[PDB]
């Protein structure tokens, strides 16, 4: 699914991203339906922007703003998220 997030300057998107650090051997990772990406949503604030856009805990991040991040390390994915400022589009797959 694709979530479209557009927030106010002073607020957050309302989620916590967790996933593999670039310093680990991320080059050895092979995506599978049971673990489809390196980064995923640890939590989503209820009635936050991400929640209202349909994101939920356990969603694995496939794309950020059209860029595939399945095999991308944490800091680089965070950089792509922050690059859009108040606007963010994320393609995810739900583990649930």
């Amino acid at each position: 699914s694709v979530a479209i997030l557009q927030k106010r300057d002073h607020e957050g998107f309302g989620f916590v991203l967790r996933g593999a650090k670039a310093e680990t051997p991320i080059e050895e990772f092979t995506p599978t339906p049971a673990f489809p990406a390196l980064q995923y949503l640890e939590s989503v604030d209820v009635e936050g922007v991400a929640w209202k856009a349909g994101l939920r805990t356990g969603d694995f991040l496939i794309e950020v703003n059209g860029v595939n991040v399945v095999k991308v390390g944490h800091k680089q994915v965070v950089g792509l998220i922050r690059q859009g400022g108040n606007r963010l589009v994320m393609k995810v797959v739900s583990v649930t």
Binding site: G12, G14, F15, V16, R18, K21, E42, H74, V78
Partner: peptide, 6 residues
């Protein structure tokens, strides 16, 4: 792993 709030 790292964790970042956004």
């Amino acid at each position: 792993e790292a964790q970042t709030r956004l």
